[PDB]
Write a protein that binds this DNA or RNA. Structure first.
Ligand code: MG
Ligand code: MG
Ligand code: MG
Ligand code: MG
Ligand code: MG
Ligand code: MG
Ligand code: MG
Ligand code: MG
Ligand code: MG
Lengths: 125, 53, 63, 240, 109, 225, 128
RNA sequence: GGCGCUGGAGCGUCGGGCCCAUACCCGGCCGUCGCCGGCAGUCGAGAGUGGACGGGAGCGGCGGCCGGAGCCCCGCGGACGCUACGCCGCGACGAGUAGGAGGGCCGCUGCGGUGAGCCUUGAAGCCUAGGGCGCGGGCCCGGGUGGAGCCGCCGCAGGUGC
C-alpha cells in the first residue's frame, strides 16, 4: 500500500538527500523533487512525471497505468509533446484534469513543464 | 490484498514468459516490519565478529 | 517577575507511541484523525491506549 | 432613477452625525420608501476566411499563460485603509495664508524670503519671491521646510493662472531610450531650458504681485535680503 | 549667506551612573537653558558634521572630506534645557564636547 | 435543486442577520437603562445627604462594597501567609490590579497583605477605563482581549451578561454573579504609575502608598493605566 | 544581472559578532570555539556586567530569514550535475554551491547546466 | 567617595519638576510549556446548526382565469499546501550551582547499506587582512601549499571531544 510503503521509505531511501537543513527526493517520477507522501513517484498506484525529451526539445509526460503495478517494465506510459508552450501546458492540463488522474499534481506538472521548456529555449545575450 | 494471491508468470531463459504460473506464496503478504528487520540484522551482524584485545 | 512555580509546567504523558511499528503508527494516524474529527470519547480513549506501553496494555484472557 | 441628494445628516464631529437613527428615518421619510420585491464576452466569433476552413473561429480573448514560474507569492490580506497619495487629505498650517512671506530653508534658494500664493493638489506650496527681487521663480516648495512669517500682502483678487498645477511643475527627464550600454557620454540635455511659457507665466504673476509689494514701505528690500542666524539670536525666542 | 542652524553641543549619551545607552545622545542647545524653551526644537533634524581622509560623494556637489551623521531631536532632557537626540548611527565618543547643528528643517512655525 | 438551495442559504443568512440586529438593539437599550440607573444612584446619594443636612442630622453613606486592589511590592522575600493571600487575590506580579468584593473575609485578607498592596474604592469612570483599555477575559485558560461582545457572551451569557456594559454593570454594582464576572476577567496588568509613587514602603496615611486610601485609588488608577 | 530570489525580506541579525570563549584571548591553547564556563567562581558564567556574553536561545534568528544568504537565496551543496536538478523547482529560493573537491572540468559542466536551468551558483567562477 | 561646600552643596520639616534597573506597560523576534488546539474537505462545487420524500389541503412573486422542474458552460478554467516524525493557530512563560532529563542536519574513528558520490583537469592534511551560514557545538565556499586518496545520507560499534 502507498501509506505502508511511505512509512518504510520516508527516511530510508536511496533517493533521499538530506543537506543544508533541506531534504530532497530524486526518484524518477517526483514533481518538485521533494521528499513527501504526495509527491513520491514510486509508492502511489497512479503517478505522473514530466521530463525533458531525449533531444533538447519538448517534454515527455509519463503516467503510471493501473494494471501492471508489480510489472515495472510495462507500468509506465511515456508520451512526447513537442508543441508550443501554451499547447503543451494545455495538453498536460487536459491529461491530469479531464482524466481525473491525480488532480492534486496538476499545477506541479504544469510548472515543471514550464521550467523544462524555459530551460530548453536558447539562451540570450 | 493479504488474502488475495496473484499468479506470477515464470520467465524462460530467453527473458519472455514460459506460460507457466505460480500462485504468489503467502510469505510475500507477510507484515513488512523494518524495525524488526533492523533489530535482527543488528544483532546477527555481531555474530560473525572476531575478538580483539 | 511573576510569582509562579515551574516544576509542574510540563505534563508527563504519552503524545505518541514510543514504538516504531509502522502498522501501529498507521492505525495511530487513523484514530488520531477519528478522535480529532468526531465527538466520540471512545476514539480518544482508544488513541491514548494505543500510545501506551506494553506494561500499560496488559494481555486480556479469554476467560 | 432619482437625483442625488445631500447628506441631510450634518456632521458635528467626525464619525458622528447631528441626527439620530429615528430622526434620520423621519428626515428621509423611510416610512414611505419601502421596497419588498420586483455581460463581458470573453470569446468573439470571427470570420476566418479561406475556403473550407469551416465557417468562423471562436477566438477567445486573454489566452492562458504560456509560462508558469516555479513558485509564486501568496496574495496579501485586506487593509481597509491606506489610500493612495493622490487621495490623501492635504493639510496646511494655519500661519500660511495666500500672500504670506515665507522663508525657504532648503535648496539653492536657501534662506530667501518668498511670497506664498496657493497650495497645490499635492500639498506643495506654490511660491514666488518675484524673480526681479531675489531670483526665485514660480516654484514649488514643501510647507514643512518653510517658516511662515507674520508679514503678509493682500494678494486676494489676483489671478493665478489655472494651468499652474503639479503636472505643470513636475520635473522632466530625457534618458534613456534607445540606449542600454553606455560607451558614449549621454550628458547632453543636462542643461535645463527655461520655457517661453514659464517666462510668460512668471511675467504675468509678477506684474500683479509687484505693485502690491511696492505699496508698503521697504518690503522689497526685505524680500531682497536673506535670512541668517546671528550669534546672539535664537530661533525659539524669535517671533516670525 | 548665513548660519541657518542652531548651535548645540554633544554633551554625552543617555546614561545612569554606571550604565551608558549609546543609542541616544544628549544635546545642549546654545541659548536654551530651561525645559519649557525646548518645545521649539522637538522633532528638528540635527547633524554631526565632520571631516575625514577619503573623499565622499556630496549631494548636489563635488566629493569632499565632509561627512554627516544625521539625526533628530526626540524629547527634552532635564529641567535645564537638555534635549535627547536619536541619530542614524550612534554618535562616536570623540564628538563629545563638539558641534551639532539643529537644522530648523521640520518647521512648525 | 439549485434554486431551492439558494433560497435556503438566503433564508438562513437573513435569519442570522435579523438575530444579530435584535441582539444589537438589546445591547443598546441595556446600556441606556444602565446609564439611567447610574445617574439615579449618583443623584440619590446627593439628595440623601441634602435632606439630612436640611434636618440637621448626618447621612452616613453605605460602606463601599467594591474595591480595586493593586499589588505595589515585588516578589522577592515575601512571607508565606502574605504570598498565599496574594495568590488568592490573583496578584502574582507587581502592578497587578483586581476587583475585590468587600466583606469581613475579604477585608481581613486585605489587612493581612496591607504592606504589599494599595487599594481603594473605584468609581464608575475608573471601572470603565479599566475594563475598556485593559480588559482581558480568561477564555479557555487563555488571556484573550475583549475586542468583541461575543467573547463575553460565550463565557458569561448563561448569567445574563452579554456585553462590555453588562460586565461593567456587574462589576460596579456588585451583582449576584459578581464572582463569575470578576473571575472571567484576567487580572489587570497595569503600567508603572506615571509621576512616581510617594513611598511604597509605608502606609498611605503616613505619607506612603501602601494600604487603604479611600477614594484616591482613582487618582492612582488614572496614572497607573 | 544576477538571478533574483522570489522574495527579499529585510534580514535582521540579533547579533553580528561571534561568541568567543572566555579567556580565549589570553591563551593560544584556548581556541575561540564557544565552551560553556562551569567554574564555581566564573564571572562570565555568573553573568557579571561588562563580561563576555554567553549564547542562549534568545539570540535565535527569525525563522523566515534563517539560513538566508545576503542575496536572499538559501544554499544547497551539489557534487555533480544530477544533484543539480533537485533545485529545478526550488529555483527561486535555493542556490547551489559546487563542492570544494569537484574538479574544474566537471564544475564547468555544472555551471553551464545551472545557467540553463536558471539556478544560481554562488561560486560560478571557482576553478579557471 | 573626592573636589569642595557656610543667602548652604549643613541640619529639621515640606512642595513642584526631573534622572534611570535586566522591575512594570506596549510592540518585534527566539525557544519552552499549555490548548492531548486546527488540517486527510486538494471538497472551483464543497455548502454542512437535519435533510429526504409523498400522496393531504393551502397561500405568497412571475408564466390570460387552466398553466412550473431549471441540468454551470460565450471562457473547460482556478495559487500554495499535507517530509501527518508534517504544516498551521492562540495564550502564558524564560535566574541557576550540586544534580536529573531531552534534542543535536554538533564533532572523531571503524563496519553493514546507499550516493551509476568526489578525485592526478588534483584526495587528505595544512595556511589565509577572502565570502558566508548557525543561539551554539560547528559547517560550507574562494585562494595558496600539497601530491593519493576522501566524504554525504540510513543504520551499527566505540580505546569518541581537554
Ligand atoms: Mg526555574
Ligand atoms: Mg527586599
Ligand atoms: Mg516624565
Ligand atoms: Mg553569526
Ligand atoms: Mg586563543
Ligand atoms: Mg561561589
Ligand atoms: Mg520574565
Ligand atoms: Mg533556565
Ligand atoms: Mg579516552
Amino acid at each position: 500500500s502507498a501509506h505502508l510503503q511511505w512509512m518504510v521509505v520516508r527516511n530510508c531511501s536511496s533517493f533521499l538527500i538530506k543537506r543544508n537543513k533541506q531534504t530532497y527526493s530524486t526518484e524518477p517520477n517526483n514533481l518538485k523533487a521533494r521528499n513527501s507522501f504526495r509527491y513520491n513517484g514510486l509508492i502511489h498506484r497512479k503517478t505522473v512525471g514530466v521530463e525533458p525529451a531525449a533531444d533538447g526539445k519538448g517534454v515527455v509526460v509519463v503516467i503510471k497505468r493501473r494494471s501492471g503495478q508489480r510489472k515495472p517494465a510495462t507500468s509506465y506510459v511515456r508520451t512526447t509533446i513537442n508543441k508550443n508552450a501554451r499547447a503543451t501546458l494545455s495538453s498536460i492540463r487536459h491529461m491530469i484534469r479531464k482524466n481525473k488522474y491525480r488532480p492534486d499534481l496538476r499545477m506541479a506538472a504544469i510548472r515543471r513543464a514550464s521550467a523544462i521548456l524555459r530551460s530548453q529555449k536558447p539562451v540570450m545575450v | 490484498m493479504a488474502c488475495a494471491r496473484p499468479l506470477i508468470s515464470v520467465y524462460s531463459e530467453k527473458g519472455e514468459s514460459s506460460g507457466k504460473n505460480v500462485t504468489l506464496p503467502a510469505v510475500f503478504k507477510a507484515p513488512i516490519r523494518p524495525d524488526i528487520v533492523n533489530f535482527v540484522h543488528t544483532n546477527l551482524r555481531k555474530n560473525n565478529r572476531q575478538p580483539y584485545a | 517577575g511573576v510569582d509562579i512555580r515551574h516544576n509542574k509546567d510540563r505534563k508527563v504523558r504519552r503524545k505518541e507511541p514510543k514504538s516504531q511499528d509502522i502498522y501501529l503508527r498507521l492505525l495511530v494516524k487513523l484514530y488520531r484523525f477519528l478522535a480529532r474529527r468526531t465527538n466520540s470519547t471512545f476514539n480518544q480513549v482508544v488513541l491514548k491506549r494505543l500510545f501506551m506501553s506494553r506494561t500499560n496494555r496488559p494481555p486480556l484472557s479469554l476467560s | 432613477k432619482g437625483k442625488p441628494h445631500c447628506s441631510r445628516n450634518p456632521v458635528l464631529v467626525r464619525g458622528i452625525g447631528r441626527y439620530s437613527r429615528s430622526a434620520m428615518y423621519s428626515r428621509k421619510a423611510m416610512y414611505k420608501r419601502k421596497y419588498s420585491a420586483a455581460k463581458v464576452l470573453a470569446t468573439v466569433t470571427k470570420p476566418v476566411g479561406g475556403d473550407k476552413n469551416g465557417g468562423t473561429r471562436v477566438v477567445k480573448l486573454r489566452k492562458m499563460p504560456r509560462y508558469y514560474p516555479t513558485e509564486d507569492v501568496p496574495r496579501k490580506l485586506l487593509s481597509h485603509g491606506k489610500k493612495p497619495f493622490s487621495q490623501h487629505v492635504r493639510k496646511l498650517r494655519a500661519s500660511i495664508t495666500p500672500g504670506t512671506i515665507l522663508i525657504i530653508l532648503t535648496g539653492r534658494h536657501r534662506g530667501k524670503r518668498v511670497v506664498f500664493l496657493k497650495q497645490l493638489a499635492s500639498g506643495l506650496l506654490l511660491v514666488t519671491g518675484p524673480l526681479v527681487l531675489n531670483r526665485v521663480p514660480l516654484r514649488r516648495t514643501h510647507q514643512k521646510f518653510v517658516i511662515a512669517t507674520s508679514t503678509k500682502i493682500d494678494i486676494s483678487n489676483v489671478k493665478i493662472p489655472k494651468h499652474l498645477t503639479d503636472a505643470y511643475f513636475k520635473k522632466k527627464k530625457l534618458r534613456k531610450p534607445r540606449h542600454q550600454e553606455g560607451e558614449i557620454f549621454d550628458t547632453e540635455k543636462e542643461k535645463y531650458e527655461i520655457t517661453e511659457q514659464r517666462k510668460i507665466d512668471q511675467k504675468a504673476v509678477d506684474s500683479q504681485i509687484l505693485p502690491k509689494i511696492k505699496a508698503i514701505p521697504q518690503l522689497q528690500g526685505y524680500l531682497r535680503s536673506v535670512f541668517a542666524l546671528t550669534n546672539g539670536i535664537y530661533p525659539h525666542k524669535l517671533v516670525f | 549667506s548665513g548660519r541657518l542652524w542652531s548651535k548645540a553641543i554633544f554633551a554625552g549619551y543617555k546614561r545612569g551612573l554606571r550604565n551608558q545607552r549609546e543609542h541616544t545622545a544628549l544635546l545642549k542647545i546654545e541659548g536654551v537653558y530651561a525645559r519649557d524653551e525646548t518645545e521649539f526644537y522637538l522633532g528638528k533634524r540635527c547633524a554631526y558634521v565632520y571631516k575625514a581622509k577619503n573623499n565622499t560623494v556630496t549631494p548636489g556637489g563635488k566629493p569632499n572630506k565632509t561627512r554627516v551623521i544625521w539625526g533628530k531631536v526626540t524629547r527634552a532632557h532635564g529641567n535645564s534645557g537638555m534635549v535627547r537626540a536619536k541619530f542614524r548611527s550612534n554618535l562616536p565618543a570623540k564628538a563629545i564636547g563638539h558641534r551639532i547643528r539643529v537644522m530648523l528643517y521640520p518647521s512648525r512655525i | 435543486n439549485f434554486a431551492e438551495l439558494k433560497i435556503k442559504r438566503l433564508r438562513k443568512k437573513f435569519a442570522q442577520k435579523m438575530l444579530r440586529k435584535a441582539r444589537r438593539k438589546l445591547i443598546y437599550e441595556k446600556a441606556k437603562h444602565y446609564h439611567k440607573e447610574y445617574r439615579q444612584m449618583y443623584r440619590t446619594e446627593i439628595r440623601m445627604a441634602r435632606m439630612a443636612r436640611k434636618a440637621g442630622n448626618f447621612y452616613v453613606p453605605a460602606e463601599p462594597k467594591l474595591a480595586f486592589v493593586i499589588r505595589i511590592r515585588g516578589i522577592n522575600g515575601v512571607s508565606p501567609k502574605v504570598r498565599k493571600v496574594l495568590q488568592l487575590l490573583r496578584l502574582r506580579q507587581i502592578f497587578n490590579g483586581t476587583f475585590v468584593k468587600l466583606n469581613k473575609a475579604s477585608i481581613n485578607m486585605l489587612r493581612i497583605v496591607e504592606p504589599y498592596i494599595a487599594w481603594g474604592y473605584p468609581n464608575l469612570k475608573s471601572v470603565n477605563e479599566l475594563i475598556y483599555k485593559r480588559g482581558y477575559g480568561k477564555i479557555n485558560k487563555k488571556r484573550i482581549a475583549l475586542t468583541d461582545n461575543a467573547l463575553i457572551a460565550r463565557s458569561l451569557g448563561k448569567y445574563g451578561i452579554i456585553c462590555m456594559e453588562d460586565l461593567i454593570h456587574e462589576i460596579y454594582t456588585v451583582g449576584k454573579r459578581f464572582k463569575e464576572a470578576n473571575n472571567f476577567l484576567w487580572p489587570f496588568k497595569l503600567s508603572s504609575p506615571r509621576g512616581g509613587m510617594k513611598k511604597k514602603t509605608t502606609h498611605f496615611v503616613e505619607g506612603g502608598d501602601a494600604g487603604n486610601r479611600e477614594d484616591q485609588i482613582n487618582r492612582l488608577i488614572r496614572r497607573m493605566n | 544581472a544576477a538571478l533574483r530570489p522570489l522574495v527579499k525580506p529585510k534580514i535582521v541579525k540579533k547579533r553580528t559578532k561571534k561568541f568567543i570563549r572566555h579567556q580565549s584571548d589570553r591563551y593560544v591553547k584556548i581556541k575561540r570555539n564557544w565552551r560553556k564556563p562551569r567554574g564555581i567562581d566564573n564571572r562570565v558564567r555568573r553573568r557579571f556586567k561588562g563580561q563576555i556574553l554567553m549564547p542562549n536561545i534568545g539570540y535565535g534568528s527569525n525563522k523566515k530569514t534563517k539560513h538566508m544568504l545576503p542575496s536572499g537565496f538559501r544554499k544547497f551543496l551539489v557534487h555533480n550535475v544530477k544533484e543539480l536538478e533537485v533545485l529545478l523547482m526550488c529555483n527561486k529560493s535555493y542556490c547551489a554551491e559546487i563542492a570544494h573537491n569537484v574538479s574544474s572540468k566537471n564544475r564547468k559542466a555544472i555551471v553551464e547546466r545551472a545557467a540553463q536551468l536558471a539556478i544560481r551558483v554562488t561560486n560560478p567562477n571557482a576553478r579557471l
